[PDB]
Amino acid sequence: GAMAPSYRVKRMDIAKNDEECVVNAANPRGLPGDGVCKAVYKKWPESFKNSATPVGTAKTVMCGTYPVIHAVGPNFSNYTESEGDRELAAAYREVAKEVTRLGVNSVAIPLLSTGVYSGGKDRLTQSLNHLFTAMDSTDADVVIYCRDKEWEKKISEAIQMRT
Ligand SMILES: [Cl-]
Ligand SMILES: [Cl-]
Ligand SMILES: [Cl-]
């Protein structure tokens, strides 16, 4: 575990992370996809061997010795708000199980279901709060990756609020 487990936020491409493993915002079919998923496919394409997994789950595939945790959030275009919220919470719970099992001291994580799976809604707070619920009991250093300047400020504020 990390000496003093922390949360941090960075505004940059998660494919250039400085952590011991990465969480992909995957699709259920293990396809290259777009956004975070396409960046992850370009950087770790070996990790997409048998990476298909259902919504609300995470499946880890090694690229060399570097673990890629494929986490499948719900597409809110297809799910009800209620069922989508349950599957989004579940995906993060499965990420915490994998991070624990791998014994890593640090993980790079995107906000699941906040881009093309958002159903056109701002889900920063919803997604981040499910991330915290799952990861708070882990002792890995968590580094959240985002691309928008206003998102970086709001995520940083939420981290700092808990102290
Ligand atoms: Cl970048
Ligand atoms: Cl997304
Ligand atoms: Cl973003």
From Swiss-Prot:
In the N-terminus, the macro domain displays a mono-ADP-ribosylhydrolase activity. The central part called, the alphavirus unique domain (AUD) has a zinc-binding function. The C-terminus region, also called hypervariable domain (HVD), is mainly disordered and binds several host proteins. This intrinsically disordered domain contains 2 SH3 domain-binding sites and 2 FGDF motifs necessary and sufficient for the formation of nsP3/G3BP complexes. This is Non-structural protein 3. Changing residue 27 to A: Partial loss of mono-ADP-ribosylhydrolase activity; complete loss of ADP-ribose 1'' phosphate phosphatase activity. The chain holds residues 1334 to 1493 of 2474 of the full protein. It is a peripheral membrane protein. Interacts with mRNA-capping enzyme nsP1. Interacts (via C-terminus) with host G3BP1; this interaction inhibits the formation of host stress granules on viral mRNAs and the nsp3-G3BP1 complexes bind viral RNAs and probably orchestrate the assembly of viral replication complexes. Interacts (via C-terminus) with host G3BP2; this interaction inhibits the formation of host stress granules on viral mRNAs and the nsp3-G3BP2 complexes bind viral RNAs and probably orchestrate the assembly of viral replication complexes. Interacts (via C-terminus) with host NAP1L1. Residues 4-163 form the Macro domain. Seems to be essential for minus-strand RNAs and subgenomic 26S mRNAs synthesis. Displays mono-ADP-ribosylhydrolase activity. ADP-ribosylation is a post-translational modification that controls various processes of the host cell and the virus probably needs to revert it for optimal viral replication. Binds proteins of G3BP family and sequesters them into the viral RNA replication complexes thereby inhibiting the formation of host stress granules on viral mRNAs. It is found in: Host cytoplasmic vesicle membrane. Changing residue 13 to A: Partial loss of ADP-ribose 1'' phosphate phosphatase activity. ADP-D-ribose binds at residues 13, 27, 35, 115-117. Phosphorylated by host on serines and threonines.
